Amino acid sequence: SFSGKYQLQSQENFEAFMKAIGLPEELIQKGKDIKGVSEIVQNGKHFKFTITAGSKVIQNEFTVGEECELETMTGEKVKTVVQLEGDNKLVTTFKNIKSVTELNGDIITNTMTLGDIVFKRISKRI
Ligand SMILES: CCCCCCCC/C=C\CCCCCCCC(=O)O
Ligand SMILES: CCCCCCCC/C=C\CCCCCCCC(=O)O
């Protein structure tokens, strides 16, 4: 069950991922420690998100099994389709990054794997 407004608790490889993809140290030092809200509304295939990237609210919707355009940090807007296992594990192919989102009861983890860099968020359902 994915529906909820999930507040951020722990954020792992933020400094190593944002410098590896080409972002500024001034904006990285602002968004690294802010405990913001990460929303998801589960409508069968269409998952409507409202995500806090430090100060910016990035709101887009992903379709499980058909093409869906989402905003990236380095780039523009990526058509990344998401596959679902057991109503808790969401897997996609972003801008050369394997993104794995897992729901453990009422706590969600977003693990963005870029080769050796493992960018892991840990947010609780509210
Ligand atoms: C889907 C969950 C993962 C979301 C990851 C978002 C990563 C954002 C990374 C870097 C951008 C940080 C921007 C910080 C605010 C800058 C503007 C300001 O307040 O001055
Ligand atoms: C590089 C980050 C750009 C911002 C959008 C990233 C979207 C990734 C795609 C699909 C997974 C969406 C997961 C939504 C829940 C995030 C929970 C969290 O913030 O802790």
Side-chain angles (χ1 to χ4, degrees):
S1 180
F2 278 93
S3 294
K5 290 175 185 287
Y6 303 78
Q7 198 182 4
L8 181 62
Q9 296 283 20
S10 183
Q11 195 162 227
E12 191 191 279
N13 285 290
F14 194 96
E15 270 278 285
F17 189 98
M18 290 62 201
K19 278 187 270 276
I21 67 161
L23 258 80
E25 293 202 273
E26 178 270 311
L27 309 181
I28 304 165
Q29 269 34 254
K30 283 171 169 173
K32 65 174 283 285
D33 302 299
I34 298 164
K35 289 198 177 192
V37 177
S38 287
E39 191 177 65
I40 308 168
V41 194
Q42 185 177 16
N43 298 270
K45 291 173 103 292
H46 287 92
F47 281 57
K48 297 171 199 294
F49 73 43
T50 314
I51 306 303
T52 49
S55 304
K56 193 189 179 187
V57 180
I58 301 170
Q59 68 290 85
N60 288 274
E61 75 179 288
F62 64 91
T63 312
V64 172
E66 281 289 2
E67 66 139 61
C68 45
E69 55 174 65
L70 303 181
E71 190 191 266
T72 173
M73 283 297 113
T74 305
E76 63 311 89
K77 218 181 182 190
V78 69
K79 283 192 175 191
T80 187
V81 76
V82 193
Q83 275 61 72
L84 179 59
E85 188 191 278
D87 204 34
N88 84 315
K89 294 164 186 287
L90 284 169
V91 298
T92 200
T93 304
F94 207 83
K95 298 285 288 195
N96 301 87
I97 302 140
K98 188 117 299 292
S99 187
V100 176
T101 321
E102 197 177 79
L103 221 185
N104 281 269
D106 287 310
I107 71 94
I108 199 163
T109 204
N110 196 67
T111 311
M112 280 193 157
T113 62
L114 175 61
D116 293 282
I117 312 288
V118 179
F119 170 44
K120 192 180 180 181
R121 274 193 170 192
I122 301 88
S123 299
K124 184 158 202 293
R125 198 185 193 169
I126 281 170

mmCIF file of all heavy atoms in Angstrom, residues 6-8 17-18 21 37-40 49 51-53 58 62 70-74 80 82 90 92 94 97 99 101 108-110 112 119 121-123, ligand 2:
data_model
loop_
_atom_site.group_PDB
_atom_site.id
_atom_site.type_symbol
_atom_site.label_atom_id
_atom_site.label_comp_id
_atom_site.label_asym_id
_atom_site.label_seq_id
_atom_site.Cartn_x
_atom_site.Cartn_y
_atom_site.Cartn_z
ATOM 1 N N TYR A 6 5.020 10.928 3.022
ATOM 2 C CA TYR A 6 6.157 10.330 3.777
ATOM 3 C C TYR A 6 7.243 11.378 4.167
ATOM 4 O O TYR A 6 7.956 11.875 3.292
ATOM 5 C CB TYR A 6 6.797 9.173 2.941
ATOM 6 C CG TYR A 6 5.912 7.988 2.489
ATOM 7 C CD1 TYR A 6 5.047 8.133 1.397
ATOM 8 C CD2 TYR A 6 6.015 6.739 3.109
ATOM 9 C CE1 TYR A 6 4.266 7.070 0.967
ATOM 10 C CE2 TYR A 6 5.245 5.665 2.664
ATOM 11 C CZ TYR A 6 4.363 5.838 1.604
ATOM 12 O OH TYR A 6 3.568 4.805 1.201
ATOM 13 N N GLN A 7 7.405 11.716 5.463
ATOM 14 C CA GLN A 7 8.467 12.676 5.888
ATOM 15 C C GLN A 7 9.883 12.013 5.991
ATOM 16 O O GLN A 7 10.057 10.941 6.582
ATOM 17 C CB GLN A 7 8.068 13.424 7.184
ATOM 18 C CG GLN A 7 8.911 14.710 7.410
ATOM 19 C CD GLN A 7 8.629 15.502 8.685
ATOM 20 O OE1 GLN A 7 7.846 15.146 9.560
ATOM 21 N NE2 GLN A 7 9.301 16.616 8.829
ATOM 22 N N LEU A 8 10.896 12.704 5.442
ATOM 23 C CA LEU A 8 12.302 12.229 5.410
ATOM 24 C C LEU A 8 12.985 12.193 6.811
ATOM 25 O O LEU A 8 12.928 13.150 7.587
ATOM 26 C CB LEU A 8 13.062 13.107 4.375
ATOM 27 C CG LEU A 8 14.565 12.795 4.127
ATOM 28 C CD1 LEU A 8 14.805 11.379 3.573
ATOM 29 C CD2 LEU A 8 15.158 13.829 3.160
ATOM 30 N N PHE A 17 26.687 11.352 -4.702
ATOM 31 C CA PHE A 17 25.824 11.288 -5.918
ATOM 32 C C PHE A 17 25.699 12.644 -6.671
ATOM 33 O O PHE A 17 25.990 12.685 -7.868
ATOM 34 C CB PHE A 17 24.463 10.668 -5.496
ATOM 35 C CG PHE A 17 23.477 10.306 -6.621
ATOM 36 C CD1 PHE A 17 23.385 8.996 -7.105
ATOM 37 C CD2 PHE A 17 22.597 11.277 -7.113
ATOM 38 C CE1 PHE A 17 22.419 8.660 -8.050
ATOM 39 C CE2 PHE A 17 21.632 10.942 -8.057
ATOM 40 C CZ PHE A 17 21.543 9.635 -8.522
ATOM 41 N N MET A 18 25.290 13.735 -5.998
ATOM 42 C CA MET A 18 25.151 15.076 -6.630
ATOM 43 C C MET A 18 26.481 15.651 -7.228
ATOM 44 O O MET A 18 26.445 16.190 -8.338
ATOM 45 C CB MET A 18 24.419 16.024 -5.652
ATOM 46 C CG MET A 18 22.917 15.747 -5.414
ATOM 47 S SD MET A 18 22.652 14.123 -4.669
ATOM 48 C CE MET A 18 20.931 13.807 -5.078
ATOM 49 N N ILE A 21 27.081 13.282 -10.557
ATOM 50 C CA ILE A 21 26.196 13.700 -11.698
ATOM 51 C C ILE A 21 26.374 15.191 -12.186
ATOM 52 O O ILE A 21 25.745 15.571 -13.179
ATOM 53 C CB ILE A 21 24.690 13.313 -11.452
ATOM 54 C CG1 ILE A 21 23.998 14.070 -10.282
ATOM 55 C CG2 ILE A 21 24.498 11.783 -11.302
ATOM 56 C CD1 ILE A 21 22.462 14.051 -10.304
ATOM 57 N N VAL A 37 8.792 16.538 3.100
ATOM 58 C CA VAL A 37 7.717 15.554 2.765
ATOM 59 C C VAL A 37 7.922 14.978 1.317
ATOM 60 O O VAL A 37 8.263 15.699 0.371
ATOM 61 C CB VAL A 37 6.305 16.211 2.987
ATOM 62 C CG1 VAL A 37 5.114 15.302 2.599
ATOM 63 C CG2 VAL A 37 6.050 16.643 4.454
ATOM 64 N N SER A 38 7.689 13.667 1.171
ATOM 65 C CA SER A 38 7.710 12.953 -0.129
ATOM 66 C C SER A 38 6.350 12.213 -0.269
ATOM 67 O O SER A 38 6.118 11.150 0.310
ATOM 68 C CB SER A 38 8.873 11.951 -0.179
ATOM 69 O OG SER A 38 10.138 12.593 -0.316
ATOM 70 N N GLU A 39 5.439 12.803 -1.039
ATOM 71 C CA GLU A 39 4.071 12.259 -1.243
ATOM 72 C C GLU A 39 3.973 11.203 -2.380
ATOM 73 O O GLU A 39 4.698 11.272 -3.376
ATOM 74 C CB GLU A 39 3.167 13.475 -1.561
ATOM 75 C CG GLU A 39 1.636 13.241 -1.570
ATOM 76 C CD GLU A 39 0.844 14.510 -1.827
ATOM 77 O OE1 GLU A 39 0.948 15.084 -2.933
ATOM 78 O OE2 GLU A 39 0.118 14.946 -0.911
ATOM 79 N N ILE A 40 3.044 10.246 -2.230
ATOM 80 C CA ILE A 40 2.679 9.289 -3.314
ATOM 81 C C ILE A 40 1.129 9.047 -3.199
ATOM 82 O O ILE A 40 0.616 8.765 -2.110
ATOM 83 C CB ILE A 40 3.451 7.913 -3.280
ATOM 84 C CG1 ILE A 40 5.003 8.026 -3.215
ATOM 85 C CG2 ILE A 40 3.070 7.013 -4.493
ATOM 86 C CD1 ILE A 40 5.738 6.711 -2.903
ATOM 87 N N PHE A 49 3.129 11.726 -7.428
ATOM 88 C CA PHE A 49 4.079 12.162 -6.370
ATOM 89 C C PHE A 49 4.204 13.702 -6.178
ATOM 90 O O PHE A 49 4.083 14.483 -7.128
ATOM 91 C CB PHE A 49 5.440 11.406 -6.489
ATOM 92 C CG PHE A 49 6.499 11.663 -7.596
ATOM 93 C CD1 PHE A 49 6.876 12.940 -8.036
ATOM 94 C CD2 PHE A 49 7.257 10.566 -8.014
ATOM 95 C CE1 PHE A 49 7.966 13.109 -8.885
ATOM 96 C CE2 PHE A 49 8.339 10.728 -8.873
ATOM 97 C CZ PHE A 49 8.693 12.002 -9.308
ATOM 98 N N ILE A 51 7.325 15.591 -4.390
ATOM 99 C CA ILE A 51 8.647 15.334 -3.731
ATOM 100 C C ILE A 51 9.392 16.656 -3.372
ATOM 101 O O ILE A 51 9.561 17.556 -4.198
ATOM 102 C CB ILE A 51 9.529 14.373 -4.616
ATOM 103 C CG1 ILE A 51 8.848 13.026 -5.006
ATOM 104 C CG2 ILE A 51 10.929 14.059 -4.021
ATOM 105 C CD1 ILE A 51 8.355 12.133 -3.855
ATOM 106 N N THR A 52 9.913 16.725 -2.141
ATOM 107 C CA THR A 52 10.717 17.877 -1.653
ATOM 108 C C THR A 52 12.243 17.620 -1.878
ATOM 109 O O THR A 52 12.885 16.781 -1.227
ATOM 110 C CB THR A 52 10.410 18.211 -0.161
ATOM 111 O OG1 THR A 52 10.466 17.043 0.649
ATOM 112 C CG2 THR A 52 9.043 18.872 0.073
ATOM 113 N N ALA A 53 12.815 18.373 -2.825
ATOM 114 C CA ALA A 53 14.277 18.400 -3.088
ATOM 115 C C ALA A 53 14.923 19.622 -2.361
ATOM 116 O O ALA A 53 15.342 20.607 -2.979
ATOM 117 C CB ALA A 53 14.421 18.416 -4.622
ATOM 118 N N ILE A 58 9.015 19.129 -6.390
ATOM 119 C CA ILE A 58 9.008 18.474 -7.733
ATOM 120 C C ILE A 58 7.786 17.502 -7.764
ATOM 121 O O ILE A 58 7.828 16.408 -7.188
ATOM 122 C CB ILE A 58 10.385 17.768 -8.026
ATOM 123 C CG1 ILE A 58 11.600 18.745 -7.979
ATOM 124 C CG2 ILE A 58 10.378 17.032 -9.394
ATOM 125 C CD1 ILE A 58 12.988 18.085 -8.007
ATOM 126 N N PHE A 62 4.023 8.856 -12.145
ATOM 127 C CA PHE A 62 4.591 7.682 -12.859
ATOM 128 C C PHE A 62 3.553 6.554 -13.102
ATOM 129 O O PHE A 62 2.816 6.128 -12.207
ATOM 130 C CB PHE A 62 5.916 7.168 -12.250
ATOM 131 C CG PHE A 62 5.907 6.609 -10.817
ATOM 132 C CD1 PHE A 62 5.700 5.242 -10.603
ATOM 133 C CD2 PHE A 62 6.142 7.448 -9.725
ATOM 134 C CE1 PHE A 62 5.762 4.716 -9.314
ATOM 135 C CE2 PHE A 62 6.178 6.922 -8.434
ATOM 136 C CZ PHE A 62 6.002 5.560 -8.233
ATOM 137 N N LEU A 70 9.463 12.068 -15.943
ATOM 138 C CA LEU A 70 9.780 12.617 -14.593
ATOM 139 C C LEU A 70 11.018 13.568 -14.652
ATOM 140 O O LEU A 70 12.017 13.266 -15.314
ATOM 141 C CB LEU A 70 10.063 11.453 -13.595
ATOM 142 C CG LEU A 70 8.972 10.367 -13.373
ATOM 143 C CD1 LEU A 70 9.476 9.349 -12.339
ATOM 144 C CD2 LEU A 70 7.621 10.936 -12.912
ATOM 145 N N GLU A 71 10.984 14.708 -13.937
ATOM 146 C CA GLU A 71 12.143 15.653 -13.874
ATOM 147 C C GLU A 71 13.377 15.055 -13.108
ATOM 148 O O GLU A 71 13.267 14.416 -12.058
ATOM 149 C CB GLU A 71 11.637 16.967 -13.216
ATOM 150 C CG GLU A 71 12.630 18.157 -13.288
ATOM 151 C CD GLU A 71 12.254 19.353 -12.435
ATOM 152 O OE1 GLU A 71 11.602 20.293 -12.935
ATOM 153 O OE2 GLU A 71 12.669 19.414 -11.255
ATOM 154 N N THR A 72 14.555 15.292 -13.688
ATOM 155 C CA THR A 72 15.871 14.850 -13.147
ATOM 156 C C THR A 72 16.698 16.052 -12.588
ATOM 157 O O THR A 72 16.472 17.224 -12.907
ATOM 158 C CB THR A 72 16.625 14.034 -14.255
ATOM 159 O OG1 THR A 72 17.955 13.703 -13.866
ATOM 160 C CG2 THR A 72 16.749 14.698 -15.634
ATOM 161 N N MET A 73 17.699 15.724 -11.754
ATOM 162 C CA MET A 73 18.700 16.725 -11.264
ATOM 163 C C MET A 73 19.654 17.177 -12.420
ATOM 164 O O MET A 73 19.696 18.366 -12.747
ATOM 165 C CB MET A 73 19.455 16.189 -10.016
ATOM 166 C CG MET A 73 18.672 16.250 -8.694
ATOM 167 S SD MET A 73 18.301 17.968 -8.283
ATOM 168 C CE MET A 73 16.511 17.968 -8.460
ATOM 169 N N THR A 74 20.390 16.238 -13.045
ATOM 170 C CA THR A 74 21.169 16.513 -14.283
ATOM 171 C C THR A 74 20.293 16.007 -15.476
ATOM 172 O O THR A 74 19.916 14.826 -15.543
ATOM 173 C CB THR A 74 22.569 15.837 -14.256
ATOM 174 O OG1 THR A 74 23.292 16.231 -13.094
ATOM 175 C CG2 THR A 74 23.471 16.196 -15.449
ATOM 176 N N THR A 80 10.930 7.176 -17.729
ATOM 177 C CA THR A 80 11.391 6.034 -16.895
ATOM 178 C C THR A 80 10.165 5.192 -16.432
ATOM 179 O O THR A 80 9.426 5.593 -15.525
ATOM 180 C CB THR A 80 12.260 6.627 -15.733
ATOM 181 O OG1 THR A 80 12.890 5.608 -14.970
ATOM 182 C CG2 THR A 80 11.539 7.557 -14.737
ATOM 183 N N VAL A 82 8.264 2.201 -14.402
ATOM 184 C CA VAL A 82 8.516 1.552 -13.088
ATOM 185 C C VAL A 82 7.802 0.161 -13.040
ATOM 186 O O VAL A 82 6.627 0.041 -13.397
ATOM 187 C CB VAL A 82 8.104 2.528 -11.926
ATOM 188 C CG1 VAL A 82 8.648 2.042 -10.570
ATOM 189 C CG2 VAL A 82 8.551 4.011 -12.067
ATOM 190 N N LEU A 90 9.430 -1.114 -6.032
ATOM 191 C CA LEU A 90 9.321 -0.390 -7.331
ATOM 192 C C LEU A 90 10.732 -0.225 -7.980
ATOM 193 O O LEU A 90 11.612 0.420 -7.402
ATOM 194 C CB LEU A 90 8.681 0.998 -7.069
ATOM 195 C CG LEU A 90 7.155 1.059 -6.820
ATOM 196 C CD1 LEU A 90 6.800 2.463 -6.312
ATOM 197 C CD2 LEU A 90 6.314 0.758 -8.074
ATOM 198 N N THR A 92 13.096 1.015 -11.509
ATOM 199 C CA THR A 92 13.133 1.767 -12.808
ATOM 200 C C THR A 92 14.587 2.064 -13.321
ATOM 201 O O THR A 92 15.594 1.871 -12.626
ATOM 202 C CB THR A 92 12.184 3.011 -12.769
ATOM 203 O OG1 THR A 92 11.869 3.425 -14.095
ATOM 204 C CG2 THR A 92 12.667 4.259 -12.008
ATOM 205 N N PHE A 94 16.519 5.233 -14.778
ATOM 206 C CA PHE A 94 16.428 6.720 -14.887
ATOM 207 C C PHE A 94 17.481 7.278 -15.924
ATOM 208 O O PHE A 94 17.601 6.738 -17.029
ATOM 209 C CB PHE A 94 16.531 7.186 -13.395
ATOM 210 C CG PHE A 94 15.872 8.515 -13.018
ATOM 211 C CD1 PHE A 94 14.504 8.530 -12.742
ATOM 212 C CD2 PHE A 94 16.614 9.692 -12.868
ATOM 213 C CE1 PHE A 94 13.868 9.719 -12.397
ATOM 214 C CE2 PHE A 94 15.979 10.876 -12.502
ATOM 215 C CZ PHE A 94 14.604 10.894 -12.285
ATOM 216 N N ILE A 97 20.845 5.381 -14.172
ATOM 217 C CA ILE A 97 20.794 5.115 -12.703
ATOM 218 C C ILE A 97 19.677 4.039 -12.480
ATOM 219 O O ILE A 97 18.537 4.207 -12.936
ATOM 220 C CB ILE A 97 20.464 6.439 -11.907
ATOM 221 C CG1 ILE A 97 21.441 7.638 -12.121
ATOM 222 C CG2 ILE A 97 20.313 6.219 -10.379
ATOM 223 C CD1 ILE A 97 20.738 9.006 -12.208
ATOM 224 N N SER A 99 17.082 2.913 -10.090
ATOM 225 C CA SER A 99 16.334 3.389 -8.896
ATOM 226 C C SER A 99 15.411 2.276 -8.320
ATOM 227 O O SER A 99 14.497 1.796 -8.998
ATOM 228 C CB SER A 99 15.556 4.660 -9.299
ATOM 229 O OG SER A 99 14.930 5.268 -8.165
ATOM 230 N N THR A 101 12.856 1.576 -5.164
ATOM 231 C CA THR A 101 12.066 2.137 -4.028
ATOM 232 C C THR A 101 11.368 0.972 -3.251
ATOM 233 O O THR A 101 10.487 0.321 -3.823
ATOM 234 C CB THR A 101 11.042 3.229 -4.480
ATOM 235 O OG1 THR A 101 11.543 4.087 -5.504
ATOM 236 C CG2 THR A 101 10.571 4.118 -3.321
ATOM 237 N N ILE A 108 9.286 4.015 3.851
ATOM 238 C CA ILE A 108 9.744 3.862 2.441
ATOM 239 C C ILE A 108 11.253 4.215 2.280
ATOM 240 O O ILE A 108 11.736 5.212 2.829
ATOM 241 C CB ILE A 108 8.793 4.676 1.490
ATOM 242 C CG1 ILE A 108 8.893 4.197 0.017
ATOM 243 C CG2 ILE A 108 8.981 6.217 1.570
ATOM 244 C CD1 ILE A 108 7.730 4.656 -0.876
ATOM 245 N N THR A 109 11.988 3.408 1.496
ATOM 246 C CA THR A 109 13.409 3.698 1.158
ATOM 247 C C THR A 109 13.583 3.881 -0.372
ATOM 248 O O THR A 109 13.207 2.992 -1.134
ATOM 249 C CB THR A 109 14.392 2.655 1.772
ATOM 250 O OG1 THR A 109 15.695 3.226 1.909
ATOM 251 C CG2 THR A 109 14.574 1.325 1.033
ATOM 252 N N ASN A 110 14.176 4.996 -0.822
ATOM 253 C CA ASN A 110 14.459 5.221 -2.268
ATOM 254 C C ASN A 110 15.988 5.055 -2.501
ATOM 255 O O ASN A 110 16.773 5.926 -2.114
ATOM 256 C CB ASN A 110 13.897 6.593 -2.716
ATOM 257 C CG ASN A 110 13.811 6.717 -4.240
ATOM 258 O OD1 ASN A 110 13.032 6.030 -4.890
ATOM 259 N ND2 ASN A 110 14.624 7.531 -4.864
ATOM 260 N N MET A 112 18.851 4.958 -5.128
ATOM 261 C CA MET A 112 19.341 5.299 -6.492
ATOM 262 C C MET A 112 20.801 4.790 -6.675
ATOM 263 O O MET A 112 21.770 5.382 -6.185
ATOM 264 C CB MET A 112 19.205 6.820 -6.742
ATOM 265 C CG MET A 112 17.788 7.284 -7.117
ATOM 266 S SD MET A 112 17.848 8.976 -7.734
ATOM 267 C CE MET A 112 16.323 8.992 -8.691
ATOM 268 N N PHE A 119 22.768 6.080 -3.533
ATOM 269 C CA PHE A 119 22.012 7.196 -2.887
ATOM 270 C C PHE A 119 20.698 6.666 -2.234
ATOM 271 O O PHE A 119 19.696 6.450 -2.921
ATOM 272 C CB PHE A 119 21.819 8.360 -3.905
ATOM 273 C CG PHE A 119 20.863 9.508 -3.501
ATOM 274 C CD1 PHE A 119 20.900 10.056 -2.213
ATOM 275 C CD2 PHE A 119 19.871 9.936 -4.392
ATOM 276 C CE1 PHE A 119 19.925 10.958 -1.803
ATOM 277 C CE2 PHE A 119 18.901 10.849 -3.983
ATOM 278 C CZ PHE A 119 18.927 11.356 -2.686
ATOM 279 N N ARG A 121 17.563 7.230 0.438
ATOM 280 C CA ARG A 121 16.649 7.960 1.364
ATOM 281 C C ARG A 121 15.872 6.944 2.272
ATOM 282 O O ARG A 121 15.624 5.795 1.889
ATOM 283 C CB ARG A 121 15.641 8.832 0.562
ATOM 284 C CG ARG A 121 16.129 10.243 0.155
ATOM 285 C CD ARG A 121 14.948 11.098 -0.340
ATOM 286 N NE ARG A 121 15.319 12.524 -0.522
ATOM 287 C CZ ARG A 121 14.447 13.518 -0.710
ATOM 288 N NH1 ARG A 121 13.156 13.346 -0.857
ATOM 289 N NH2 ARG A 121 14.902 14.736 -0.734
ATOM 290 N N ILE A 122 15.492 7.379 3.485
ATOM 291 C CA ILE A 122 14.664 6.577 4.435
ATOM 292 C C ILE A 122 13.582 7.582 4.968
ATOM 293 O O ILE A 122 13.895 8.475 5.764
ATOM 294 C CB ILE A 122 15.505 5.877 5.570
ATOM 295 C CG1 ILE A 122 16.615 4.887 5.082
ATOM 296 C CG2 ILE A 122 14.582 5.091 6.540
ATOM 297 C CD1 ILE A 122 17.994 5.513 4.792
ATOM 298 N N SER A 123 12.316 7.423 4.537
ATOM 299 C CA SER A 123 11.197 8.343 4.896
ATOM 300 C C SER A 123 9.999 7.571 5.539
ATOM 301 O O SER A 123 9.602 6.506 5.060
ATOM 302 C CB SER A 123 10.757 9.089 3.608
ATOM 303 O OG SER A 123 11.814 9.881 3.055
HETATM 304 C C1 LIG B 2 17.603 12.609 -9.261
HETATM 305 C C2 LIG B 2 16.324 12.961 -8.489
HETATM 306 C C3 LIG B 2 15.263 13.659 -9.361
HETATM 307 C C4 LIG B 2 13.879 13.789 -8.681
HETATM 308 C C5 LIG B 2 12.827 12.716 -9.055
HETATM 309 C C6 LIG B 2 13.241 11.248 -8.820
HETATM 310 C C7 LIG B 2 12.124 10.249 -9.178
HETATM 311 C C8 LIG B 2 12.587 8.778 -9.114
HETATM 312 C C9 LIG B 2 11.558 7.834 -9.707
HETATM 313 C C10 LIG B 2 10.758 6.969 -9.069
HETATM 314 C C11 LIG B 2 10.714 6.692 -7.582
HETATM 315 C C12 LIG B 2 9.825 7.689 -6.811
HETATM 316 C C13 LIG B 2 9.907 7.448 -5.295
HETATM 317 C C14 LIG B 2 9.000 8.380 -4.472
HETATM 318 C C15 LIG B 2 9.208 8.272 -2.944
HETATM 319 C C16 LIG B 2 10.480 8.964 -2.423
HETATM 320 C C17 LIG B 2 10.631 8.866 -0.890
HETATM 321 C C18 LIG B 2 11.732 9.725 -0.280
HETATM 322 O O1 LIG B 2 11.816 10.933 -0.609
HETATM 323 O O2 LIG B 2 12.224 9.319 0.793
#
